[PDB]
Design a protein around this ligand. Structure first.
Ligand SMILES: [Cd+2]
Ligand SMILES: [Cd+2]
Length: 26
């Protein structure tokens, strides 16, 4: 499902999902 990690390069307790820059990279 969803649930970020610090390994991503952004905070773990995310603001939600899609709006975050979590997927603006490739
Ligand atoms: Cd995030
Ligand atoms: Cd993330």
């Amino acid at each position: 499902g969803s649930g970020c990690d610090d390994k991503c390069g952004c905070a773990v307790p995310c603001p939600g999902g899609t709006g975050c820059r979590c997927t603006s990279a490739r």
